[model samples]
Target: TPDVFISYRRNSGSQLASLLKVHLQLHGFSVFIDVEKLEAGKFEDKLIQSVMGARNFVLVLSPGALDKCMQDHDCKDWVHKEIVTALSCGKNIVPIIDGFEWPEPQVLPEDMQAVLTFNGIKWSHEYQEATIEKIIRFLQ
Candidate 1:
């Protein structure tokens, strides 16, 4: 089972997500990223199981990460679904805001907007190592 499930936007946030996974793995933390495993099964089932099984939900909030969710009330974006699933399972959601500042509360959907309340680990370009260190410490 994975200790952390990484959720991020494929286009904009994937790089950071992949890098973070590698760093977490080096630190002996079992991590789950969606694209790595494509074994035979329903996509939805696999995603939910991975998210539920993991103890921590590491959300990658890169630039425009939540645009789709805010645009459509009933959005089908995986990041959106991943969050709701994690929330439902009572997983520890730890957000990492890479380079974007959020717009406003009402900009996102009702169910997902509550996530903004969590204390996110903001990445610092100059202090990259310190950011990951903070994340690892929190995951502990």
Candidate 2:
């Protein structure tokens, strides 16, 4: 039922996610953004359900988003999992780069490297109005 499902890191991407939620809502979009305090049990199930039903899956990528995975080659963090799930579901995946450079393809896990190749939008406070408009336009 949602127009977009937002995937972001709680540490850094949450603030931007919150802002996007408001902006998207103003544009009459139904959005799903996972809360920081996740409930126990079936969390992954809920994520898959939300993402599968969404027309677009937006990943708010910040520096911290990939830090954990970069630190550990074997790491399978939630962000990574959400991206893979969205990819598998064939959802429209949008990487919103915010104050961080996109990670090189070689540094990311094989499954996540696809994210870098997709055309991405940037976010900054000074130009948020324009950024929001562009993103909303894409969603439409």
Candidate 3:
């Protein structure tokens, strides 16, 4: 099973998410990034299973990433559902704000407001080395 499940909006934060995956893998951490792990199709069962099995859920928040997914009832956007599943399974959640400030709880869907309660880190290419070091340390 993977140690971390990475959730992010495809067009918005995918580049950063991909980089993080490679970095974590180099440090001997198993990571689950959907496009890298699943064949293209509706694979909700596979996605949910991965989220439940992971030890950590790392949410990469970029501008518009969260808003794009809030339309689904049950907040079923891939990223949103992964968070809900992880929370239900009692997995650790790590929110990483990439090139944007964390959204306020009131501005998010009611279910997603829980994300604000967790401590999160800010990520930027300017400080990637230090940022990645902090993330890897947390996984240890």
Candidate 4:
């Protein structure tokens, strides 16, 4: 059972997502993160299943995670679709933010507006233990 679903940008948030995955798993949570070769149809199906079945949706935002959120590609934008799905499913969406600050509501996609309503955790590498502890407490 996947208790947490982590979504991150491969270029900027990959390593951070990987680290968080390990920590969450160590804390006895089953985390679902995409770490396999993409095969299209099945990937989306698997993603939907994992996200819907999960209790927590962990969205990892690095410097440029959502830079393309307002872009034209609908189906091509996997991150946006993931957020929309999580929001629609009423999952507890937890955004793990690093140096990235969220833009105004009008600047984001329609459904993405809900993200600002949820309190997010500011992650600092210097206080790794404290940050992880905070996430652990929230997920627990």
Candidate 5:
């Protein structure tokens, strides 16, 4: 079992997650990311299990994640479901926004708004390394 779960769309942020996963692994976190670990056949059961079992859920929120969350039946947006389940199970939930701006209460759904929020550490100049450090702190 891993301590942290990384949720993101492969089409949107594969490179970013790969680098983040490397840094996080170095810092002693076992990361569960579907693009690298999950096989083609698995979907609901494995995704649900990963989210429910994790100590911390890291959502790499971006345009794709947000779009998925807004939808009712897309498996890609399972991050929202994972978040709700993890919170109910008493796991720490960490939402990390990528390109999209950090959503305000008006922007997110009621369920999402209820949980705590973290300002997105932008992947811009000068703070790229610093931002990764901040994300690592969320695990601790």
Candidate 6:
């Protein structure tokens, strides 16, 4: 099975996710990403359950994801659902801040101030291989 499941927006984060998946798999880590594996108009429940089952949840934060959440208004944000579920389950919640900042309540709604924090690896600050290694070490 997979050790890491990547949550990403296909429109913008696909390339980065793909690259990370390649690097991760090469280093002996099983990675899952929703680029094309899941079919449309089906399996919403399965997706949620599978996402919650992952050992580590990697959320790819970007403006588009934030905008999509805003567009959803009343309903809970899908990303937030995934993140909160992972957090509640005690899974390793890693946020890869491609450009977005960490610790934004708007980004992490439903989490308390104490459980309301994340440590992100900024693309500008470090290389992905290094971050992946760090995650691998932590997970092990």
Best by TM-score: 1
**Which residue ranges in model 4 land beyond 4 Å of their true spot?**
36-41, 73-75
Model 2 spans > 4 angstroms off: 36-41, 71-75
In model 1, how large is the Cα lDDT of residue 3?
96
- Assess each prediction's global lDDT (C-alpha) against the native: 0.87, 0.79, 0.81, 0.84, 0.70, 0.65
- For residues 1-140, could you state the per-residue lDDT of candidate 2 as single tens digits? 78888988888987888888888888898888877324467887877777788989988988768776654545357777777778888888888988777667787778767777777898877887999988987783
For each candidate in turn, the TM-score is 0.93, 0.88, 0.89, 0.91, 0.77, 0.74
Q: What is the lDDT of candidate 5?
A: 0.70
- lDDT of predicted model 3: 0.81
Candidate 1 structure lDDT: 0.87
**Candidate 5 TM-score to native:** 0.77
Maximum-lDDT candidate: 1
Model 6 spans > 4 angstroms off: 39-41, 71-76, 102-108, 111-116, 125-128
Ordered from best to worst TM-score, the candidate numbers read 1, 4, 3, 2, 5, 6
The window of 10 residues in a row where model 3 has the poorest summed lDDT is: 68-77
lDDT of 6 at 25: 81
Across 37-85, the per-residue lDDT of candidate 4 in tens digits comes to 2235767787777788889999998987888787534545888888888
Error of 3 at 77 (Å): 1.8
Error of 3 at 113 (Å): 1.2
Looking at model 6, which ten-residue stretch has the lowest summed lDDT?
107-116
Q: Write the per-residue lDDT of candidate 5 for residues 9-58, one digit (tens) a residue.
A: 76787777777789888888898888766766568788788787888877
